[PDB]
Amino acid sequence: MIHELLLALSGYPGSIFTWNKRSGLQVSQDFPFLHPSETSVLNRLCRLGTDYIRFTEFIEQYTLHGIYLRAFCTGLDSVLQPYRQALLDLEQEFLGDPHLSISHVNYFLDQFQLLFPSVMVVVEQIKSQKIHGCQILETVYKHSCGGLPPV
Amino acid sequence: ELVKDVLNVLIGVVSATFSLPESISSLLSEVAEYGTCYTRLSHFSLQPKGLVFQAFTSGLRRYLQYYRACVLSTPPTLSLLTIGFLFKKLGRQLRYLAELCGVAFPTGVKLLSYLYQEALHNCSNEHYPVLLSLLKTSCEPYTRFIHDWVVFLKHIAHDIYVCGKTINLLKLC
Amino acid sequence: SRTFLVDPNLDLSIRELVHRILPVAASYSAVTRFIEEKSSFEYGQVNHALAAAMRTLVKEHLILVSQLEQLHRQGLLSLQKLWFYIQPAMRTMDILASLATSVDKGECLGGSTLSLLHDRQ
Amino acid sequence: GQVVFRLQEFFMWALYKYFISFKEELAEIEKCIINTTITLAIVVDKLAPRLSQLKVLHKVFSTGVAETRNVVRASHLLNTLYKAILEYDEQTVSLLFSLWVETVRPYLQTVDEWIVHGTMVSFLKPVLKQIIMAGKSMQLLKNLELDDVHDPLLAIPHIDKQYLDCCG
Numbered sequence: 001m002i003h004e005l006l007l008a009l010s011g012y013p014g015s016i017f018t019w020n021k022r023s024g025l026q027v028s029q030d031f032p033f034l035h036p037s038e039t040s041v042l043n044r045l046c047r048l049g050t051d052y053i054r055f056t057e058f059i060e061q062y063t064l065h066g067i068y069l070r071a072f073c074t075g076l077d078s079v080l081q082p083y084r085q086a087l088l089d090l091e092q093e094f095l096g097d098p099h100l101s102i103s104h105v106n107y108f109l110d111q112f113q114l115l116f117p118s119v120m121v122v123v124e125q126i127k128s129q130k131i132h133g134c135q136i137l138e139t140v141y142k143h144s145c146g147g148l149p150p151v
Numbered sequence: 152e153l154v155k156d157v158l159n160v161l162i163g164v165v166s167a168t169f170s171l172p173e174s175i176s177s178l179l180s181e182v183a184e185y186g187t188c189y190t191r192l193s194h195f196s197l198q199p200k201g202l203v204f205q206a207f208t209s210g211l212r213r214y215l216q217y218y219r220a221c222v223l224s225t226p227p228t229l230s231l232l233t234i235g236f237l238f239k240k241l242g243r244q245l246r247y248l249a250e251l252c253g254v255a256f257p258t259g260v261k262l263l264s265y266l267y268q269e270a271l272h273n274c275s276n277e278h279y280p281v282l283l284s285l286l287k288t289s290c291e292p293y294t295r296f297i298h299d300w301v302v303f304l305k306h307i308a309h310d311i312y313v314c315g316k317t318i319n320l321l322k323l324c
Numbered sequence: 325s326r327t328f329l330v331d332p333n334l335d336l337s338i339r340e341l342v343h344r345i346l347p348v349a350a351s352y353s354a355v356t357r358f359i360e361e362k363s364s365f366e367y368g369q370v371n372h373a374l375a376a377a378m379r380t381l382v383k384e385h386l387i388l389v390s391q392l393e394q395l396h397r398q399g400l401l402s403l404q405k406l407w408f409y410i411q412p413a414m415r416t417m418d419i420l421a422s423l424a425t426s427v428d429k430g431e432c433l434g435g436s437t438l439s440l441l442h443d444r445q
Numbered sequence: 446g447q448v449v450f451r452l453q454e455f456f457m458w459a460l461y462k463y464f465i466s467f468k469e470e471l472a473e474i475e476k477c478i479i480n481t482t483i484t485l486a487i488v489v490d491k492l493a494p495r496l497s498q499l500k501v502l503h504k505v506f507s508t509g510v511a512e513t514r515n516v517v518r519a520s521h522l523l524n525t526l527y528k529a530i531l532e533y534d535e536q537t538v539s540l541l542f543s544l545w546v547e548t549v550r551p552y553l554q555t556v557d558e559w560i561v562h563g564t565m566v567s568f569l570k571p572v573l574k575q576i577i578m579a580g581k582s583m584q585l586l587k588n589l590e591l592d593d594v595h596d597p598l599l600a601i602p603h604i605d606k607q608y609l610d611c612c613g
Binding site: 044099101103104107110114147148149150 | 453456457458461464465468472475476479480550551
């Protein structure tokens with residue numbers, strides 16, 4: 001189930017983690033093998049997966065036109081690189097000792113959980129206001145004076 | 152392990168699941184369709200009509216080999232998800248090269264200038280070096296022609312036509 | 325014009341790539357036969373020095389096969405890695421296998437073998 | 446759980462940083478469960494110096510959640526800490542202090558940025574006039590480490606000589 005999840009957090013949905021076009025990633029229903037209390041933390045964990053999927057779908061779509069939009073997505077993958085790299089690691093730690101639970105996996109994301117949310121509305125302002133041209137170099141700058149150090 | 156299967160699609164060789172849970176197929180298709188353009192290039196740029204089209208065709212193979220060089224180099228056997236993420240910042244660029252070519256197509260000066268307008272159209276992005284290295288060699292034979300007599304502003308268009316015939320006339324005298 | 329046979333029972337993921345390497349051998353079995361024949365005196369003083377200068381490249385093609393076997397002992401030579409190594413040889417032994425088949429088609433000796441090298445990296 | 450669930454529902458970079466380290470102690474205990482006897486009355490007493498530090502946050506954060514303008518929600522929060530620390534004047538003080546610096550980092554930045562790049566607390570009242578008259582005067586100049594000084598003073602005029610140069 002661990003390697004099952006680490007793919008769901010990568011952009012591949014399956015039977016355990018269904019995909020909905022409006023809401024986002026979420027667990028289907030109660031599962032007998034697992035506990036009924038975990039059905040929550042996963043839903044808290046998917047609030048992160050939905051961000052990466054809606055990210056990479058937009059990144060590929062390139063959608064509006066202009067070089068400053070092309071380069072924004074070109075750079076948007078660079079900030080998103082430590083997310084992937086930190087996800088490849090989780091499998092290595094689980095390959096060593098088979099006593100690690102979802103608690104530790106949820107704990108490992110830590111920084112990504114408080115970063116994506118603030119870098120989600122920056123994309124939404126673009127696709128909802130047709131920000132064409134060099135005006136992006138301000139719409140991203142007006143959000144660069146944020147307090148959150150990571151952002 | 153399936154990694155030697157997915158990695159052997161960017162090369163073009165068919166596999167057990169590549170002909171010519173259960174959600175992996177969606178993940179597989181995102182790396183699969185990448186392969187369909189790689190083969191769709193060798194079918195298009197294999198020949199050694201026009202002279203400048205050959206050089207551009209000869210410049211393209213100077214690039215694909217690098218794409219064949221990067222693969223089969225780093226990963227012996229890595230995680231499945233690592234493949235999709237590693238070949239994203241590079242894979243999408245491969246699909247962009249399909250918009251450039253056909254997979255009609257101009258020739259002569261009409262092509263040496265069409266490729267130029269593809270630079271300013273997408274200059275600052277990450278597609279600047281690759282297009283430049285093509286234009287830098289897609290104009291190599293055309294300079295030689297210019298190296299004999301020795302849209303764009305017409306103030307110099309008609310002048311080039313006479314700046315050469317003079318050299319071609321002094322060669323016979 | 326050489327034809328080859330591979331295997332009735334082999335992996336299809338190999339035979340399609342084998343047929344991509346052989347065109348440097350078939351284009352070689354027609355150059356080495358051009359040397360051992362157009363060296364006969366009854367062919368002029370041009371079809372000779374054309375066969376000599378066409379031999380130094382065959383020597384450098386035999387060194388490129390030696391350095392592959394010595395690199396094959398350490399196992400560092402995978403089939404996919406082979407298709408990339410011989411690429412300089414697939415282009416050169418494709419040029420000479422075209423002159424050696426176009427100098428013998430129309431019997432040329434003397435000046436008419438020096439014209440063909442002026443019309444034909 | 447209520448104290449930690451509400452915070453998770455909810456400056457955060459300081460709070461978030463505390464949780465990672467706190468999580469490591471809880472995660473470590475889980476290791477000794479799968480691989481010594483362990484029962485209820487032992488894990489609780491082992492977690493005493495944490496369930497103590499956690500109760501403080503339920504009272505410090507309660508004043509950072511009960512509140513509309515963006516300048517009163519941030520002033521009243523940052524002022525609650527400096528008041529709640531003087532009440533506690535050791536491990537509980539090390540937490541609030543390490544929680545303080547990472548929340549006053551915004552102001553200390555703009556204050557410096559205003560200086561070099563050009564309903565009232567009586568703490569700084571006896572010199573406030575020399576501040577405004579230096580702040581505004583500095584802004585009209587560009588158009589044409591203070592905390593790291595107060596602390597060394599504790600080991601052995603900083604705000605006035607600096608002002609005298611600007612107006613001068």
